[PDB]
Design a protein around this ligand. Structure first.
Ligand SMILES: Nc1nccc(-c2c(-c3ccc(F)cc3)ncn2[C@H]2CC[C@H](O)CC2)n1
Ligand SMILES: [Cl-]
Length: 293
């Protein structure tokens, strides 16, 4: 099982949106890589569109490099830069709470990461801790929070018109229920606001250890999502964000954005960098997980 001229496929490492994950090696360069495989027989093929989105991003900071897309036996394969553990993995290592300092270092970076994605005319639509990975150990980039898995992304600027996509409502909801915006639950088309709201939910998950809508079950997926959305609507921001005034300010701001509105990314960063400085924290990448296995 080679992918392309030069990538050897090795052991299983994980799962993502519309594909499975192996360690690989570029034999020509003696460098390890990650390989996502999607069965060619897939009823709902997502890997090639994902490849196109990575190419549209180029590389910015925290964007994994993509090396190859092509067939591999009965699979389509995409070869990516190998990264380190996800924020969910690191959260588990840290007993499922992060310090304010760690959350702020994450948040400052991910506001910028999302601004970059939005600058390439994409919305992300799959915010979750499993999709944010540090770099590799002893790598120049173990400190950097990367974004992966663009299978659910969407162009929000139509390349034909150069205009923002129109507002509309949808039957099917995109993304992870725990983090999605309130408007996502209501079947609205997602836009830039929704990515930033989902980040806010994720930040609060890290600070609190959990979100209050986590334990909800139902007989249908639709009912489950409805109950989660209902709890999000029913939970005041001042309650969710007790003890974190700046998070309350962030969440209120993003929840109140118009569908078409460009977020004030500078404002949101400044909420958090002003807080960071006021607390006497140093931006030294000494996250909670440093010095753990
Ligand atoms: N360590 C690591 N390096 C780069 C990408 C991936 C990864 C990928 C991936 C995406 C597209 C590709 F072409 C290859 C891999 N999808 C999920 N992940 C990780 C998510 C976190 C999980 O605990 C392990 C797998 N993994
Ligand atoms: Cl290997």
């Amino acid at each position: 099982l080679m992918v392309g001229p030069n990538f050897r496929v090795g052991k299983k490492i994980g799962c993502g949106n519309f594909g499975e994950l192996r360690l690989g090696k570029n034999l020509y360069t003696n460098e390890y890589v990650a390989i996502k495989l999607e069965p060619m027989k897939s009823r709902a093929p997502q890997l090639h569109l994902e490849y196109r989105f990575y190419k549209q991003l180029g590389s910015g900071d925290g964007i994994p490099q993509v090396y190859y897309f092509g067939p591999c036996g009965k699979y389509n394969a995409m070869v990516l830069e190998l990264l380190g553990p996800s924020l969910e993995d690191l959260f588990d290592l840290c007993d499922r709470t992060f310090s304010l300092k760690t959350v702020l270092m994450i948040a400052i970076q991910l506001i910028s990461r999302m601004e970059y994605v939005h600058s390439k005319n994409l919305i992300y639509r799959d915010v979750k801790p499993e999709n944010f990975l540090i770099g590799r150990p002893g790598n120049k980039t173990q400190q950097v929070i990367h974004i992966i898995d663009f299978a659910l992304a969407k162009e929000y600027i139509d390349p034909e018109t150069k205009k923002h996509i129109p507002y509309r409502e949808h039957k099917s909801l995109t993304g992870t229920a725990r983090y999605m915006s309130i408007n996502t639950h209501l079947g609205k088309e997602q836009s830039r606001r929704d990515d930033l709201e989902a980040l806010g939910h994720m930040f609060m998950y890290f600070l609190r250890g959990s979100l209050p809508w986590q334990g909800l079950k139902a007989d249908t997926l639709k009912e489950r999502y409805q109950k989660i959305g209902d709890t999000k609507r029913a939970t005041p921001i001042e309650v969710l964000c007790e003890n974190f005034p700046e998070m309350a300010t962030y969440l209120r701001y993003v929840r109140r954005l118009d569908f078409f509105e460009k977020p004030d990314y500078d404002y949101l960063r400044k909420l958090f960098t002003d807080l960071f400085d006021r607390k006497g924290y140093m931006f030294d990448y000494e996250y909670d997980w440093i010095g753990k296995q």
